[PDB]
Amino acid sequence: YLMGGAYRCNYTRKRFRTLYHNLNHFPFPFHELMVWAVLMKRQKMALFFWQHGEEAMAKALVACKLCKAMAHEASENDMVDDISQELNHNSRDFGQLAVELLDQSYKQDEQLAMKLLTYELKNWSNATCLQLAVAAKHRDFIAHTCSQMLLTDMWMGRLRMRKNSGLKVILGILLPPSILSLEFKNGRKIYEFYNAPIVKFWFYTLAYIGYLMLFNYIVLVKMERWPSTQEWIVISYIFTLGIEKMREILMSEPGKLLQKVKVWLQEYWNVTDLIAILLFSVGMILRLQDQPFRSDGRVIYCVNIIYWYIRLLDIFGVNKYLGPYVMMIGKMMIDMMYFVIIMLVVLMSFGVARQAILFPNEEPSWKLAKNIFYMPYWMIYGEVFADQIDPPCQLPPCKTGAWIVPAIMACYLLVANILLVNLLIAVFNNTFFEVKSISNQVWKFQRYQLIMTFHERPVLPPPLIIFSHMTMIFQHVCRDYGLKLFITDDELKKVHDFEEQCIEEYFREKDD
Amino acid sequence: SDGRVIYCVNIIYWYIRLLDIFGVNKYLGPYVMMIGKMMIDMMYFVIIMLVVLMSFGVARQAILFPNEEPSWKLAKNIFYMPYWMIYGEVFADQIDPPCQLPPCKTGAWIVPAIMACYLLVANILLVNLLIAVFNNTFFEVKSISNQVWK
Ligand SMILES: CCCCCCCC(=O)OC[C@H](COP(=O)(O)O[C@@H]1[C@H](O)[C@H](O)[C@@H](OP(=O)(O)O)[C@H](OP(=O)(O)O)[C@H]1O)OC(=O)CCCCCCC
Ligand SMILES: COCC(CCO[C@H]1CC[C@@]2(C)C(=CC[C@H]3[C@@H]4C[C@@H]5O[C@]6(CC[C@@H](C)CO6)[C@@H](C)[C@@H]5[C@@]4(C)CC[C@@H]32)C1)COC
Ligand SMILES: COCC(CCO[C@H]1CC[C@@]2(C)C(=CC[C@H]3[C@@H]4C[C@@H]5O[C@]6(CC[C@@H](C)CO6)[C@@H](C)[C@@H]5[C@@]4(C)CC[C@@H]32)C1)COC
Ligand code: NA
Ligand code: NA
């Protein structure tokens, strides 16, 4: 219950249940001893038990996750609020121990360090160290150099092209004969090329670019009574994308259909995609009707194309420099919202004053609510036309107190364009280093999720993914790498010896 | 006439090449190299602004004119007016015209709202973030430029 949905402790297995039914020993006693010390808030005992035995990094990550879960449970049940602080401190200590051990292992030997993070852990419900670190939301562990290089190796697949990627992958996708010219890591070459995560990502990117081109074409030119070929291709793309989203919902982690909906709705992109697909379905339904409903469907298409243009930032978030910038944009959006509230108050004040002064004989109409916001808002973006505001009133009679409007305009412009915008620039300037560092760490953490979700995806892009969906139905009646790495007993022994050497060297260096 | 036009483009280049001569002054060389690096940063932010601009332009062109034959003038109206709009030319009669009066197009009230959102994003968020980026990465660039010039 504390670890997660997919975790399976050895105590609840059928073999241990049968052994405990008629009541031996434990192969690794320090695992159970450290779990006991962690569950009972004995930090010194847990730290003593951590450095004895094998799988030190796995024990550190498991202890960090357990302490975090216990802190959350204690804070939920209104404890003394000092237990929660102690548990959070314990979790931070164990996370720091894991990070320092990883740093020592990577500094000593690199290949064995990578082998440490991917080999399957039989004692911990068959989960690698990367999965334990991700399940603990440990951002400083995934953002380490060794974890990043391992993720790059997983992302590149079975290819060794490391000089200039992307262009060669694009050439291979566009020229299938050009595939048999790339070096591979130690017929089947095509299967290894089309199953790498990077090739799947570029296939999806090219399909999305073509879909955007077709959407622009169908909205720009005149729409006839019945959909043209490009409109049918766009509708097919939307339908297959919706089917793929439903398939991803179905194969989530929880065992209930209603519970998987919440977990899938955790991310904002999924919610926005669902809303956009529903809106496109409504617009397509309204499009196949008479003329006014056809126009309404066309307008819905235009709004939807705004969203699908905006969604290119998700694709851009794979570049090393275009992901942190997008997350910085997100946080600066919150700050800009606060300052927009104040500017809106000032703008409403000026607009109401000018509208009331200049036009004193207006009947109640909804056009009054438009003149308040429209002109003062366009005024602060350079459209400061001084004949439309305070007109020179042969000449028409001057309204009573119409000389106040230019003075109020001067004060409003001085406040809006010299004070608030400069203060906003200062706010963005003095809170940039922290936001930049946080964005870098979060992007390096989410690289793992990107790689995993493109490793689990099918090969064909959504325009022609309907073939891959039918094969799953046909195979319904019937991880060597990418997730784990299975090794023999000699390799396991060598890994254990290397880890013990690393931890004893780390403690010796710390003491010295 | 074609040769004359090529001459005009070439004169642009030969005017730009005065920075090579300016790079002998003690204070006008480091500034040019700083300009070079800030050009790379400005390229990154130009990509994002271009995405936003294309979205708004396509939306406005599709909403306002629904009976246009396929022509290369469509590809011009997307980039032209939204690009000149963010440099102070925010003429509100050319965009969302007041439609004696001609009939109002279906859903033509969305264009000013989209314009407001687009202006707020382009002129308050991205440019201020670019100013912050230039501001917080100036000391290192300045020192590197001084060393490289020397
Ligand atoms: C339509 C596309 C829109 C979505 C764009 C999709 C998002 C996107 O832009 O891709 C990112 C990727 C760039 O990364 P890519 O692997 O190709 O190359 C990186 C680049 O060469 C850096 O200079 C390297 O060192 P550093 O960082 O300076 O230290 C870095 O090495 P490392 O540190 O990793 O070991 C390299 O990774 O691909 C391209 O843009 C190449 C042209 C292909 C795209 C151009 C053709 C379209
Ligand atoms: C074309 O003819 C229209 C007619 C119906 C006319 O009804 C009128 C009823 C009052 C109403 C809704 C109208 C115009 C100004 C409207 C104000 C604008 C204000 O703005 C807000 C702005 C921001 C707020 C903070 C302050 O108030 C409103 C509370 C305020 C506001 C909405 C009060 C309501 C006013 C229209 C049709 O019927 C046959
Ligand atoms: C004067 O008459 C011209 C006529 C030839 C007309 O051909 C038309 C063919 C479609 C084409 C090339 C035309 C106008 C809009 C064009 C779109 C603009 C889009 O912009 C881009 C913008 C940015 C992209 C991201 C999205 O798409 C295009 C993929 C898109 C684009 C280039 C698709 C192609 C469209 C012209 C002459 O023949 C006798
Ligand atoms: Na201006
Ligand atoms: Na102007």
Q: How far is CA A137 from CA A69, A92, A130, A157, in A?
A: 12, 12, 11, 25
Residue B108 CB partners (closer than 8 Å, separation 6+) = B63, B64, B96, B99
> Which SS3 state, helix, strand or coil, does residue A387 take?
coil
HEC states along A35-46?
Answer: HHHHHCCCHHHH
- Rounded to the nearest angstrom, the gap between the alpha carbon of residue B126 and the centroid of all alpha carbons in its chain is 12
User: How would DSSP label each residue in chain B?
Assistant: -HHHHHHHHHHHHHHHTHHHHHTTSTTTSHHHHHHHHHHHHHHHHHHHHHHHHHHHHHHHHHHH--S--S-TTHHHHHHHHHHHHTTT---TTTSS----PPPPPTTTTHHHHHHHHHHHIIIIIIHHHHHHHHHHTSHHHHHHHHHHH-
Structure tokens at A414: 């001085």
Q: Looking at this protein, which amino acid is placed at residue B30?
A: P
Main-chain dihedrals φ then ψ at residue A275, nearest 5 degrees? -65, -45
Cβ atoms within 10 Å, residue B8: 9
Which region holds residue B65: left if phi is over 0, alpha if psi is between -120 and 50, else beta?
beta
- Rounded to the nearest angstrom, the gap between the alpha carbon of residue A114 and the centroid of all alpha carbons in its chain is 25
Listed in sequence order, the DSSP H helices in A288-414 are 291-310, 312-316, 324-358, 368-379, 404-414
DSSP A182: S
The whole-angstrom distance between A382's CA and the closest CA on chain B is 5
User: Per-residue b/e over A39-63, b at no fewer than 16 CB within 10 Å?
Assistant: eeeebeebbebbbebbbbbbbbbbb
What distance in Å separates the CA atoms of residue B109 and residue A367, rounded to the nearest whole number?
13
CA-based nearest residue in chain A for residue B128: A425
Instruction: Please give the interface size between A and B, counted as residue pairs whose CB atoms are below 8 Å apart.
Output: 119
Identify which of A413, A343, A374, A301 has the alpha carbon closest to the alpha carbon of residue B116.
A374
The closest ligand to the CA of B88 turns out to be 4
For the Cβ of A67 lying below 6 angstroms from any atom of ligand 1, the answer is: no
Distance A373 CA to ligand 2 centre (A): 13
Identify which of A69, A29, A27 has the alpha carbon closest to the alpha carbon of residue A49.
A29
- Binding-site residues, ligand 3, Cβ < 6 A: A 212-213, 216-217, 220; B 70-72, 74-75
Asked whether the beta carbons of residue A305 and residue B62 sit closer than 8 angstroms, the reply is yes
Query: Using CB atoms within 10 A of its CB, is residue B56 exposed (0-12), middle (13-18) or buried (19+)?
Result: buried
Mutate to test the pocket of ligand 1, among A173, A319, A320, A321 (most ligand atoms within 8 A of CB): A320
Asked whether the beta carbons of residue A381 and residue B88 sit closer than 8 angstroms, the reply is yes
Q: Are the CB atoms for B57 and B79 separated by under 8 Å?
A: yes
What distance in Å separates the CA atoms of residue A64 and residue A80, rounded to the nearest whole number?
21
Triad A357, A358, A359: Cα angle to 5°: 100
Question: Which residues have a C–N gap over 2.5 Å right after them in chain A?
Answer: 23, 186, 393, 478
Structure tokens at A243: 């089917």
DSSP A381: T
Residue of B111, B119, B124, B126 best to disrupt the A interface, most CBs of A under 10 A = B124
Main-chain dihedrals φ then ψ at residue B88, nearest 5 degrees? 100, -15
HSE-CB for A428 with a 13 A CA cutoff: 29
What distance in Å separates the CA atoms of residue A8 and residue B29, rounded to the nearest whole number?
65
Q: Looking at this protein, which amino acid is placed at residue A178?
A: S
Q: Are the CB atoms for A75 and A58 separated by under 8 Å?
A: no
DSSP A10: G
Distance A313 CA to ligand 1 centre (A): 15
User: How would DSSP label each residue in A428-444?
Assistant: HHHTSHHHHHHHHHHHH
Main-chain dihedrals φ then ψ at residue A322, nearest 5 degrees? -105, 5
- Rounded to the nearest angstrom, the gap between the alpha carbon of residue A106 and the centroid of all alpha carbons in its chain is 27
User: How would DSSP label each residue in A325-342?
Assistant: HHHHHHHHHHHHHHHHHH
Residue B89 CB partners (closer than 8 Å, separation 6+) = A382
CA-based nearest residue in chain A for residue B48: A313
Distance A244 CA to ligand 1 centre (A): 28
What distance in Å separates the CA atoms of residue A442 and residue A131, rounded to the nearest whole number?
16
Which region holds residue A137: left if phi is over 0, alpha if psi is between -120 and 50, else beta?
left
Asked whether the beta carbons of residue B74 and residue A220 sit closer than 8 angstroms, the reply is yes
What distance in Å separates the CA atoms of residue A186 and residue A160, rounded to the nearest whole number?
10
Q: How far is CA B96 from CA A387, A388, B103, in A?
A: 20, 18, 13
Q: Residue whose CA is closest, atom 29 of ligand 1?
A: A320
> Which SS3 state, helix, strand or coil, does residue A166 take?
coil
Q: Are the CB atoms for A121 and A28 separated by under 8 Å?
A: no
A219 touches B: beta carbon within 8 Å: yes
Q: What kind of experiment solved this structure?
A: cryo-EM
Q: At what angle do helices A421-430 and B127-136 cross, to 10 degrees?
A: 40
Q: Are the CB atoms for A462 and A237 separated by under 8 Å?
A: yes
Residue of B63, B96, B111, B137 best to disrupt the A interface, most CBs of A under 10 A = B63
Facing B68 at nearest CB: one of A220, A306, A383: A220
Triad A9, A11, A16: Cα angle to 5°: 130
Q: How far is CA A417 from CA A274, A428, A445, B92, in A?
A: 39, 16, 39, 20
Structure tokens at A88: 């959070």
Residue B105 CB partners (closer than 8 Å, separation 6+) = B63, B64, B66, B99
What distance in Å separates the CA atoms of residue A267 and residue A79, rounded to the nearest whole number?
30
Q: Are the CB atoms for A102 and A61 separated by under 8 Å?
A: no
Listed in sequence order, the DSSP H helices in A77-183 are 82-108, 110-118, 129-135, 139-142, 145-156, 167-174
Identify which of A492, A510, A468 has the alpha carbon closest to the alpha carbon of residue A123.
A492
What distance in Å separates the CA atoms of residue A280 and residue A285, rounded to the nearest whole number?
9
Which ligand 3 atom is at minimum distance from the Cα of B54? 23
DSSP lists the bridge partners of residue A119 as A485
- Binding-site residues, ligand 2, Cβ < 6 A: A 364-366, 368-369
Kindly list the residues from chain A whose CB atom is less than 8 angstroms away from the CB atom of residue B129: 325, 328-329, 332, 428
Q: Are the CB atoms for A142 and A133 separated by under 8 Å?
A: yes
Which region holds residue B107: left if phi is over 0, alpha if psi is between -120 and 50, else beta?
left
The closest ligand to the CA of A230 turns out to be 3
Residue A302 CB partners (closer than 8 Å, separation 6+) = A219, B58, B59, B62, B63, B107, B110
B36 touches A: beta carbon within 8 Å: no
Q: Is B27 annotated as a binding residue?
A: yes
Query: Using CB atoms within 10 A of its CB, is residue A117 exposed (0-12), middle (13-18) or buried (19+)?
Result: buried
Main-chain dihedrals φ then ψ at residue A399, nearest 5 degrees? -70, 155
Q: Are the CB atoms for B36 and B81 separated by under 8 Å?
A: no
> Which residue do the tokens 């969604």 mark?
A311
What distance in Å separates the CA atoms of residue A159 and residue A454, rounded to the nearest whole number?
16
End-to-end Cα separation, chain A, in angstroms: 41
B47 touches A: beta carbon within 8 Å: yes
What distance in Å separates the CA atoms of residue A495 and residue A489, rounded to the nearest whole number?
10
Facing A321 at nearest CB: one of B44, B54, B116: B44
